Amino acid sequence: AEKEKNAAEIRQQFAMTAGSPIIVNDKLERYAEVRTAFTHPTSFFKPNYKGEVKPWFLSAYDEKVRQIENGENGPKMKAKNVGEARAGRALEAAGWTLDINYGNIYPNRFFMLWSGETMTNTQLWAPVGLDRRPPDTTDPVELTNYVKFAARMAGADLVGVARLNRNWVYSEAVTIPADVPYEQSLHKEIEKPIVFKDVPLPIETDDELIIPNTCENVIVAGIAMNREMMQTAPNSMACATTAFCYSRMCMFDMWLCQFIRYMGYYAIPSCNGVGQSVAFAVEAGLGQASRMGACITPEFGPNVRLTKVFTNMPLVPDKPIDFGVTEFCETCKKCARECPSKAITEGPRTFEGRSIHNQSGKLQWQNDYNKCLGYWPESGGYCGVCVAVCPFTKGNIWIHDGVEWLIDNTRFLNITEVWDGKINTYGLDADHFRDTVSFRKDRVK
Amino acid sequence: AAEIRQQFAMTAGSPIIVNDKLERYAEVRTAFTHPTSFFKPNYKGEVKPWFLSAYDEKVRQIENGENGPKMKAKNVGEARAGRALEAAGWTLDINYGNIYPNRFFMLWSGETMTNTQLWAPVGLDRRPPDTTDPVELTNYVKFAARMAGADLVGVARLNRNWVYSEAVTIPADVPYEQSLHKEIEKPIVFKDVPLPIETDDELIIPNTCENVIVAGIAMNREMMQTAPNSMACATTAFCYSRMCMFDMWLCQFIRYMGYYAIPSCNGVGQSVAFAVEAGLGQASRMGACITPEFGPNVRLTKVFTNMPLVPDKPIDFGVTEFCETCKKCARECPSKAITEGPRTFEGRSIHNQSGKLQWQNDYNKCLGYWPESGGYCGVCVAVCPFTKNITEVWDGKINTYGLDADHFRDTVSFRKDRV
Ligand SMILES: Oc1c(Br)cc(Br)cc1Br
Ligand SMILES: Oc1c(Br)cc(Br)cc1Br
Ligand code: SF4
Ligand code: SF4
Ligand code: SF4
Ligand code: SF4
């Protein structure tokens, strides 16, 4: 008989011994956030469909408008009618409600405050003194169970803990001056160093973002996207599950940081800022790095968003996991073949970056992310075809042979229906939601 | 569960029975806000705003290693953690309930929001609707509501009887730090205007505001069963922040479809009445809307809109007749707030709206138990048949947002059940 899927068993079977799994060499240096394709001047500008050169997201806007007027849900993809085209873009736009300028990357601005002191919730609760009272728990074992329970309340589908590896913290962040209002933010972005110093609390000066040397740990959350919507990549409904999950990321960071602060510790939110989420997720055991560059998880494949919170709270690091992703990516190459921009390499991993957008000195598949971003104005969305076609995104990959779990090798050989089809709360799927149930035994050992 | 809800559909028409005495209810009359109920003593005998006295009890319990009134925790650390989780849950909620209309998160226009400004070049909020068919719109908006975190969603025509006659709010330029000390009353009126608008004198809802969308936000069963202790407070608090995100997400979606949308959370009007008229559940002895999926262990929020929609049918699965003989909430209520008598049209005090047939409860007695216990009680929700220690909760089953995979299939949705 078919053995019922056991996600906790799978993670236990593939757990590794302690140690960062990312292989590095001597040319590794911390990476300035401005180098990402979203922000770097060499990649930031893209043509629109009339050949006008604009910030990439404005060119993409032009294409969304064109598609709605032409009754399309994506590039050369006709919608049922204009109203359906409109509805997909309204859903996408609404999804971003709790996210600043596509990713919340500015540290200690807007939702990403490094201290709780000025938040309305902190002010309302001030008479209890939870953020001023010294911790009543210092045991990392109990703290890990408490904070993971809170993380699940706060919307994480996956949660893991690692020691903080500063290699993946950006050398300089992209941010805005503290006196700049929102409406000018996109015109006034600057860089600011992230430094580690002997100070009691995270603090920002005119010159630096200062993380305490006591900031020992990073908590990484996975925020699951919706399978049916992502499978419409590169069309509008894939954009909408992406967007909603960014607002879920923001809520998660704020909720969890407040919990940690009210336990007597400090906490730094990040969403897409501060450091490289994929590396932290790999070191925290959520999954493995992949050819496409994302963290592939046993539960969701790469079809999951990541955020993270940095803290001095004592915690028990999780073990990394190796369920064979590297070996499957070595022979699969479906994302590379299906990529509309040919951004993903079909070659071997190297330590040598393809361009300014890659951090050299770590063994990975090196992809051309200027090519990827170039397809976003062309398609009017955030693509996601590589996530959509990856066999690990399928809900159906795990089989049990009577002794142990294994990956089914056979897996590697329209939008109207989405709007009319299955949905559940937050786009989660009840046919798989059991996979993320959690008891103390799987939160801390 | 889609089977059950169709089986128990009523014919159209509001199931709340009213008489000629009914009048719209001023929000200040709630026990949370009214001057006769607002001040309560703490355990030292000092009279304070009720929530400040409740704070004093939370501090006393943490110092004493307790998770609730005369409920010892495993240790002080566990006591601290439950209150830290509770406090954190409220992060996206202003002053317990987001009730001030058109302030903070509850803006009646999207024009100033950061998301609207970022998306302004696309012009979704200025473009006329491309869809006016109420059938397609009902399908679209319910799909969006599920993306936005509703576990249940229903649509009703807007019954103005349940809209507060006057809201509790603050002047628009008052900073948060002074909000609690500068609350005022402000009329909510309906006029022939194009868009929801606020003047110095009035909150103005357009006469075109035809519909209300009601969302159910499920609480966690294991945590609510710890009522009146701290983990029941935590699931309450997290769901309030889920309510706020739902309102903003859904209002933005409706605006980007070419319509207007008014968020509300605990403000603007009476959620239980809207939820009953929208078919989420039935009114009960304790006063809550009892749902088939969650019983009363579910929070409510609602959004008002001129978007054309198909109203859902009210549901009757026997709650009134069961509450007639049950009385379990009334017997377990630590404050004797819930009546054991029959339903009437006459409120027991200023806190009830007279003129509608309901079980009349003494809500000042309920609120009085909150500073005593240091929480939001919830014992009535916990003991209700329709709903079915703290160390075991922290060490036990949890899942994303506190939802339960053993029951999550009950809220799966296809177009057939959306419209
Ligand atoms: O990660 C993303 C960012 Br940052 C911006 C936009 Br637009 C889309 C995605 Br996906
Ligand atoms: O509904 C509630 C409000 Br409004 C305030 C507090 Br405190 C607790 C609850 Br439950
Ligand atoms: S599609 Fe294949 S090669 Fe690409 S990330 Fe997925 S498994 Fe790896
Ligand atoms: S998002 Fe699209 S363009 Fe970018 S790497 Fe993936 S498949 Fe290629
Ligand atoms: S919340 Fe508690 S005190 Fe209030 S009615 Fe329910 S059982 Fe009674
Ligand atoms: S406990 Fe019994 S009487 Fe009270 S609301 Fe529930 S079913 Fe009704």
Q: Do B77 and A137 touch (CB under 8 A)?
A: yes
Between chains, do A259 and B79 touch, taking CB under 8 Å as contact?
Answer: no
**Which residues of chain B from 92 to 151 reach within 8 Å of chain A, CB to CB?**
92-96, 104, 113-115, 117-119, 121-124, 127, 129-131, 133, 136, 139-140, 143-144, 146-151
The position carrying tokens 């004493």 is B64
Q: Which ligand is nearest to the CA of A303?
A: 3
Residue with tokens 């210092």: A138
What DSSP state is assigned to residue B398? B
Cis peptide before B206 (omega within 30 of 0): no
Instruction: Inspect the interface and report whether the beta carbons of A97 and B252 lie closer than 8 Å.
Output: yes
CB A432 within 8 A of CB B405: no
Q: For ligand 1, atom 8, which residue shows the shortest CA distance? A: A382
Q: What is the CA radius of gyration of chain A?
A: 21
Nearest Cβ partner for A437 among B81, B127, B397: B397
- Do B414 and A427 make contact, defined as CB atoms within 8 angstroms? no
Which residues in chain B are closer than 8 Å to A121, comparing Cβ atoms?
87-88, 90-93
Cα–Cα distance between B98 and B105 in angstroms, integer?
7
In sequence order, what are the residues at sequence separation of 6 or more whose Cβ sits closer than 8 angstroms to the Cβ of residue B79?
A136, B61, B62, B64, B65, B66, B67, B73, B230
- Confirm if B313 and B15 have CB atoms less than 8 A apart: no
How close does chain A come to B90, measured CA to CA in Å?
7
Q: Does residue B412 belong to the interface with chain A, where contact is any CB pair within 8 Å?
A: yes
Q: How many CA atoms lie within 13 A of A234 on its CB side?
A: 25
A274 is in an annotated binding site: yes
Residues in chain B: 419
Ligand 2 site, CB within 6 A? B 32, 51, 96-97, 236, 266, 376
SS3 B39: strand
Q: Which of A431, A432, A174 is nearest to A299 (CA)?
A: A432
Is B219 annotated to bind ligand? Answer: no
Q: Is the Cβ pair A425, B139 closer than 8 Å?
A: no
Q: After which residues is chain A broken (C to N over 2.5 A)?
A: 413
d(CA A74, CA A92): 13
Extract the tokens encoding B266.
């605990």
Whose Cα sits closest to atom 1 in ligand 5? B378
Q: Which residue's CA lies nearest to atom 6 of ligand 4?
A: A386
CA distances in angstroms from B110 to A94, A201, B212, B265, B409, listed in the order given: 11, 36, 18, 16, 34
**Contact, B249 vs B141, CB < 8 A?**
no
Number of alpha carbons in the 13 Å side-chain half-sphere of residue B322: 15
> What is the number of residues in chain A?
445
Question: Could you say which of A86, A425, A434 has the minimum Cβ distance to residue B150?
Answer: A425
3-state secondary structure string across chain A: CCCCCCHHHHHHHCECCCCCCCCECCCCCCCCHHHCCCCCHHHHEEECCCCCEEEHHHHHHHHHHHHHHCCEEECCEECCCHHHHHHHHHHHHHHHHHCCCCCCCCCCCCCCCCCCCCCHHHHHHHHHCCCCCCCCCCCHHHHHHHHHHHHHHCCCCEEEEEECCHHHECCEEEECCCCCCHHHHHHCCEEEEEEEECCCCCEECCCCEEEECCCCEEEEEEEECCHHHHCCCCCHHHHHHHHHHHHHHHHHHHHHHHHHHHCCCCEECCCCCCECHHHHHHHCCCCEECCCCCEEECCCECCEEEEEEEECCCCCCCCCECCCHHHHHHHCCHHHHHCCCCCCCCCCCECCCCCCCCCCCECECCCCHHHHHHHHHHHCCCCCHHHHHCHHHCCCCEEECCCCEEECHHHHCCHHHHHCCCECHHHCCCCCHHHHCECHHHHCC
> Are A94 and B253 within 8 A, CB to CB?
yes
Cα separation of B378 and A13, whole Å?
42
Q: Which of B46, B61, B91, B135 to mutate to test the interface with A (most CBs of A within 10 A)?
A: B91
Distance CA A47, CA A51 (A): 5
At residue B61, what are phi and psi to the nearest 5 degrees? -70, -40
DSSP B267-307: SSB-HHHHHHHTTS-EE-SSSSEEBTTTBT-EEEEEEEE-S
Does the annotation list A250 as a binding residue? no
Residues of chain A numbered 50-79 and touching chain B (CB < 8 Å):
58, 61, 64-65, 68
φ, ψ at B146 (rounded to 5°): -70, -40
The CB of A391 under 6 Å from ligand 3? The reply is: yes
* Residue B40 DSSP symbol: E
Asked if residue B284 lies in contact with residue B327, where contact means CB atoms within 8 angstroms, the answer is: no
| A and B: number of Cβ contacts within 8 A | 252
Q: Which atom of ligand 5 is the closest one to the Cα of B381?
A: 6
Q: What's the gap between Cα A56 and its chain centre?
A: 21
Q: Which two tokens stand for residue B319?
A: 């709650």
Residue in A30, A174, A170 with CA at minimum distance from that of residue A109: A174
C-alpha distances (whole Å) from A10 to each of A40, A286, A313, A400 are 40, 12, 28, 10
Q: Do B130 and A91 touch (CB under 8 A)?
A: no
DSSP state of B9: B
Token output for A368: 């051309």
The DSSP letter of residue B183 is: -
For every residue of B115-148, DSSP letters joined together read HHHHHGGG-TTTSPPS---HHHHHHHHHHHHHHT
Nearest C-alpha neighbor of A86 from the set A107, A72, A100: A72
Please indicate whether, in this complex, the C-beta atoms of B401 and A99 are within 8 angstroms of each other: no
CB A7 within 8 A of CB A436: yes
Adjacent-strand bridge partners of A406: A399
Count CA atoms closer than 13 A to B91's CA, side-chain side.
Answer: 26
Beta partners for residue B356, in sequence order? B18
SS3 label, residue B57? helix
Taking the C-alpha atoms of residue A1 and residue A328, their distance in angstroms, rounded to an integer, is 27
Among B83, B147, B411, whose Cβ lies nearest the Cβ of A128? B83
- Name the burial class of residue B168, with classes exposed (0-12), middle (13-18) and buried (19+) by CB atoms within 10 angstroms of its CB: buried
> Is A306 annotated among the ligand-binding residues?
yes
- Relative orientation angle of helices B363-373 and B50-63, to the nearest 10 degrees: 30
